[PDB]
Amino acid sequence: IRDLRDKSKDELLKQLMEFKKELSQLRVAQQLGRIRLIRKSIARILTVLNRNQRESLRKVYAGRRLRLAMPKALRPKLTRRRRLALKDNEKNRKTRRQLRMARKFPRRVYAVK
Amino acid sequence: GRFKPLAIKKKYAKKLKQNRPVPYWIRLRTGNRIKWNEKRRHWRRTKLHY
Amino acid sequence: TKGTTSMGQRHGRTHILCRRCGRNAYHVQWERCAACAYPRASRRRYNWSVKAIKRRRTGTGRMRYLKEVNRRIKNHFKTSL
Amino acid sequence: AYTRPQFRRPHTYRRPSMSAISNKWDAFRVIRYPLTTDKAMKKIEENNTLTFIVDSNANKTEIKKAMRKLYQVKAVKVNTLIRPDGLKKAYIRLSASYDALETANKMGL
RNA sequence: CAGACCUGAGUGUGGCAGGACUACCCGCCGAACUUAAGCAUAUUACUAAGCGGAGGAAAAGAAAACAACCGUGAUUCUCUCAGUCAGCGGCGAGCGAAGAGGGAUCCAACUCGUUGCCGAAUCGGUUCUUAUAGGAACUUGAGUUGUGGCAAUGGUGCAGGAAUGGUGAAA
RNA sequence: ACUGCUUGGGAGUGCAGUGUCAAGCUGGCAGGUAUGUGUCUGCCAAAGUUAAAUACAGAGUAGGAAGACCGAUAGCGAACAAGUA
RNA sequence: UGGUUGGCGUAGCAAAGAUCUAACGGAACGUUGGAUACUGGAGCGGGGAAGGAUUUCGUGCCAACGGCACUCGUACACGAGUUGUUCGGAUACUGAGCACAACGUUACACCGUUUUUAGGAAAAGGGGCAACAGAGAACCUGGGAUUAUAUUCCAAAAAGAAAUUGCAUG
RNA sequence: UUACCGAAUCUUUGAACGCAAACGGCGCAUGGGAGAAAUCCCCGUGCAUGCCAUAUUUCUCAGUGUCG
Ligand SMILES: [Mg+2]
Ligand SMILES: [Mg+2]
Ligand SMILES: [Mg+2]
Ligand SMILES: [Mg+2]
Ligand SMILES: [Mg+2]
Ligand SMILES: [Mg+2]
Ligand SMILES: [Mg+2]
Numbered sequence: 001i002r003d004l005r006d007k008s009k010d011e012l013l014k015q016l017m018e019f020k021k022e023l024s025q026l027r028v029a030q031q032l033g034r035i036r037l038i039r040k041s042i043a044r045i046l047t048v049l050n051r052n053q054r055e056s057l058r059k060v061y062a063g064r065r066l067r068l069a070m071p072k073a074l075r076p077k078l079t080r081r082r083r084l085a086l087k088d089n090e091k092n093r094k095t096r097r098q099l100r101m102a103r104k105f106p107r108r109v110y111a112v113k
Numbered sequence: 114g115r116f117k118p119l120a121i122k123k124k125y126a127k128k129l130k131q132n133r134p135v136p137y138w139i140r141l142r143t144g145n146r147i148k149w150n151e152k153r154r155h156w157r158r159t160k161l162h163y
Numbered sequence: 164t165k166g167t168t169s170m171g172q173r174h175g176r177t178h179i180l181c182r183r184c185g186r187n188a189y190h191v192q193w194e195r196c197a198a199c200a201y202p203r204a205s206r207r208r209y210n211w212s213v214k215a216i217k218r219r220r221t222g223t224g225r226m227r228y229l230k231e232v233n234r235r236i237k238n239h240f241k242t243s244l
Numbered sequence: 245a246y247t248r249p250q251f252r253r254p255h256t257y258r259r260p261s262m263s264a265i266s267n268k269w270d271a272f273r274v275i276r277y278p279l280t281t282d283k284a285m286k287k288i289e290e291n292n293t294l295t296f297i298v299d300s301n302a303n304k305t306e307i308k309k310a311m312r313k314l315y316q317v318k319a320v321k322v323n324t325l326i327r328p329d330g331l332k333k334a335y336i337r338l339s340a341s342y343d344a345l346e347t348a349n350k351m352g353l
Numbered sequence: 354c355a356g357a358c359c360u361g362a363g364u365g366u367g368g369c370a371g372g373a374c375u376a377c378c379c380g381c382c383g384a385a386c387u388u389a390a391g392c393a394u395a396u397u398a399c400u401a402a403g404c405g406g407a408g409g410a411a412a413a414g415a416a417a418a419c420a421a422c423c424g425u426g427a428u429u430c431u432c433u434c435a436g437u438c439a440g441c442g443g444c445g446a447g448c449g450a451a452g453a454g455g456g457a458u459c460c461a462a463c464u465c466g467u468u469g470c471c472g473a474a475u476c477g478g479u480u481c482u483u484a485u486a487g488g489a490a491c492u493u494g495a496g497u498u499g500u501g502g503c504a505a506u507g508g509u510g511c512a513g514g515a516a517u518g519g520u521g522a523a524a
Numbered sequence: 525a526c527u528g529c530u531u532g533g534g535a536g537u538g539c540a541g542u543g544u545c546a547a548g549c550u551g552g553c554a555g556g557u558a559u560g561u562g563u564c565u566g567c568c569a570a571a572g573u574u575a576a577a578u579a580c581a582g583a584g585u586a587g588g589a590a591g592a593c594c595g596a597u598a599g600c601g602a603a604c605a606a607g608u609a
Numbered sequence: 610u611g612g613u614u615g616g617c618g619u620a621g622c623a624a625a626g627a628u629c630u631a632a633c634g635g636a637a638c639g640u641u642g643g644a645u646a647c648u649g650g651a652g653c654g655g656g657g658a659a660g661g662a663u664u665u666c667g668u669g670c671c672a673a674c675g676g677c678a679c680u681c682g683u684a685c686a687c688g689a690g691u692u693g694u695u696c697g698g699a700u701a702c703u704g705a706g707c708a709c710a711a712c713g714u715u716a717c718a719c720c721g722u723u724u725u726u727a728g729g730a731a732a733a734g735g736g737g738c739a740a741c742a743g744a745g746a747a748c749c750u751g752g753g754a755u756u757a758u759a760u761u762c763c764a765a766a767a768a769g770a771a772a773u774u775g776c777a778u779g
Numbered sequence: 780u781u782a783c784c785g786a787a788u789c790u791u792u793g794a795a796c797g798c799a800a801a802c803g804g805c806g807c808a809u810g811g812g813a814g815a816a817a818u819c820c821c822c823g824u825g826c827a828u829g830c831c832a833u834a835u836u837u838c839u840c841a842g843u844g845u846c847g
């Protein structure tokens with residue numbers, strides 16, 4: 001099945017149609033054992049074949065400039081809330097005064113003998 | 114009569130092929146519980162009013 | 164003749180199956196569902212009948228995606244690159 | 245220069261505005277399995293007519309195009325029915341130039 | 354009058370909202386049965402149902418607080434205060450707390466507006482640095498019908514840990 | 525002020541409606557019996573955020589620990605293809 | 610709540626006139642022939658709506674069910690079966706009506722108007738729905754074509770004959 | 780095969796959102812496909828409303844609003 005991944009796009013597509021054309025013929029035979037084994041090989045090719053496209057659209061939209069333009073099926077789904085929540089990038093923001101009054105009095109470590 | 118939305122025909126079609134005796138070989142499995150189908154339907158009795 | 168002879172007088176349907184709930188509760192003449200309250204967006208839900216709230220709440224079905232997102236929150240949404 | 249009793253909003257300019265195999269429908273999804281009942285065996289020999297359970301959402305023109313591709317043969321007509329069971333069933337009649345018998349046996353039937 | 358602004362549209366663009374859940378929680382709504390040996394105020398109950406909303410809790414919270422002390426010091430909670438020689442009440446049935454005190458928690462506090470001193474220092478977008486940096490250049494784009502400051506981090510790298518799992522004893 | 529609900533809150537606990545509508549040059553609010561007045565005490569409202577201790581009283585997700593509990597007419601309606609027939 | 614009981618092999622199974630015969634079948638009611646009646650065209654007729662939804666058909670079956678019996682069944686099991694350019698429906702009418710939008714009201718839209726204090730044209734009065742009996746609506750017969758479908762199937766002499774829609778073609 | 784989890788797949792719907800809906804109906808636009816003497820046919824994607832932002836190369840406009 002590693003061999004199934006070495007195949008290029010059309011080499012998969014050609015490898016795929018011969019499965020469907022042969023999966024169909026088992027269905028003809030059925031009306032009158034390998035059908036499962038075929039059906040799951042077709043699923044392997046769509047797995048490998050649907051991966052190269054998502055792996056090549058993450059490639060098209062790689063880089064900050066286009067990452068906002070990414071198809072959202074490819075955009076990192078979390079939960080609706082993890083996405084709408086403030087990111088640490090904007091969560092940990094503190095007003096400039098606070099920023100200074102935290103540097104001026106850092107949580108200095110201490111002990112009491 | 115003739116009239117059926119296909120959605121209703123798909124449902125009576127659903128209940129129709131669902132209206133079958135349990136396979137013989139299912140009863141022969143280990144730990145099997147099922148004997149008769151408990152959801153056999155008959156048009157003259159239970160009504161699938163669609 | 165309010166009994167068995169007037170049972171023959173009744174011929175229609177008040178309710179067909181709903182497009183949402185699938186209940187035979189879609190009042191065809193008032194195109195709405197008595198059960199889900201459909202086509203209204205918010206589904207019908209009353210606290211005086213929790214036996215019915217319970218009956219059709221989440222987990223009553225496949226929870227088809229919710230199983231996926233639950234597994235993910237448990238795994239910190241761990242991801243392959 | 246308005247000449248209607250009531251105002252109407254002006255035309256304003258308006259700017260014009262992942263599966264590797266997006267088309268999931270297919271000759272192989274359309275046609276499923278040939279049917280081998282004896283009403284259908286009456287048609288292959290007597291009517292030059294292959295019978296198929298075929299995808300229920302498929303239409304007739306798609307079933308022609310699918311027979312043309314799966315079994316390499318023209319379908320002079322394809323009158324489908326959807327079975328009480330819910331499967332769709334096409335009786336496809338072949339062109340006289342194509343035998344429905346030579347083809348069905350070629351098909352393993 | 355060309356534009357300008359103000360007001361308002363139309364598309365394009367990028368987003369969000371709507372649903373579910375709703376035990377708990379926040380807002381409104383709001384009964385009656387019951388009890389009073391009747392019953393209307395009362396009680397049930399500021400409950401149920403109803404509507405609307407959150408979150409992992411919520412709400413509350415940093416004094417327009419208590420006290421009246423040798424004074425305490427946000428909120429929540431808890432034990433108690435206290436079924437009260439408080440109080441409400443056909444002063445009837447009934448209802449009914451708060452301060453203090455012990456404790457839990459707590460290195461718990463902050464931010465605006467304003468005032469004063471400045472006055473675009475701001476923001477958005479674009480590019481950029483291995484970065485939609487708290488960086489930089491650039492932008493009329495927003496913004497002086499007032500952003501912001503003053504006083505009253507991002508990028509990249511290594512590791513360990515912890516935690517989960519995986520493995521693993523006697524006879 | 526009036527009204528209405530509300531509260532133990534009692535010549536008003538909170539609120540709402542409507543009318544009215546301040547002060548900050550003896551300020552304002554609280555000081556649990558109204559009023560006018562004088563002292564004193566604490567506070568500084570009408571903008572905002574904020575963990576923990578708390579709820580889970582018919583929720584969920586993923587786990588776990590239990591029981592002087594029930595023991596198949598019991599325990600959940602459901603020990604079973606149960607919110608199923 | 611479950612089971613069981615006497616009554617009790619009882620009360621009944623008495624509405625719509627009805628069967629008879631032979632042959633065969635079968636382990637023993639059906640099938641055919643004949644006889645005999647009945648329905649009596651507002652039919653125990655032939656098609657449809659609603660409704661039902663596999664009851665259809667064939668083979669088998671008759672354990673259970675068909676309140677007697679069954680060899681038979683609308684029962685059981687298995688396998689089949691419903692074919693459309695023209696039928697009906699939608700595509701494509703409007704109607705009593707309904708209601709999205711907007712707007713308004715409401716503590717709240719799950720209300721109301723049904724156009725909107727309203728800029729609704731995207732290449733004067735927004736959008737939609739609502740009739741299988743209204744409007745609309747291009748197809749007919751023959752068949753030797755089925756176990757079961759036919760105005761749907763038929764095959765090149767299409768049994769055939771049409772009409773009709775779209776595009777294109779001389 | 781079992782267990783788990785990253786990659787996907789996830790049909791019709793449903794808040795359901797292109798318009799409808801007892802219709803497996805119908806669009807407009809975009810790309811694809813088959814195909815075919817184009818018409819038809821399948822497919823993908825977009826296309827609801829409201830609101831906020833923006834027009835970053837600063838969109839097009841409307842007002843006997845204000846001026847110039
Ligand atoms: Mg009946
Ligand atoms: Mg029906
Ligand atoms: Mg009555
Ligand atoms: Mg009537
Ligand atoms: Mg048809
Ligand atoms: Mg909601
Ligand atoms: Mg009483």
Ligand SMILES: [Mg+2]
Pocket residue numbers: 210
């Ligand atoms: Mg309630």
Ligand SMILES: [Mg+2]
Pocket residue numbers: none
């Ligand atoms: Mg909070």
Ligand SMILES: [Mg+2]
Pocket residue numbers: none
């Ligand atoms: Mg708060």
Ligand SMILES: [Mg+2]
Pocket residue numbers: none
């Ligand atoms: Mg305190």
Ligand SMILES: [Mg+2]
Pocket residue numbers: 448
């Ligand atoms: Mg009380």
Ligand SMILES: [Mg+2]
Pocket residue numbers: none
């Ligand atoms: Mg400022």
Ligand SMILES: [Mg+2]
Pocket residue numbers: none
């Ligand atoms: Mg009260």
Ligand SMILES: [Mg+2]
Pocket residue numbers: 569
């Ligand atoms: Mg103040």
Ligand SMILES: [Mg+2]
Pocket residue numbers: 596
């Ligand atoms: Mg039990």
Ligand SMILES: [Mg+2]
Pocket residue numbers: 621
């Ligand atoms: Mg007797």
Ligand SMILES: [Mg+2]
Pocket residue numbers: 647649
């Ligand atoms: Mg007669």
Ligand SMILES: [Mg+2]
Pocket residue numbers: none
């Ligand atoms: Mg029969």
Ligand SMILES: [Mg+2]
Pocket residue numbers: none
């Ligand atoms: Mg049966």
Ligand SMILES: [Mg+2]
Pocket residue numbers: none
């Ligand atoms: Mg009308």
Ligand SMILES: [Mg+2]
Pocket residue numbers: none
């Ligand atoms: Mg219509």
Ligand SMILES: [Mg+2]
Pocket residue numbers: none
């Ligand atoms: Mg008509």
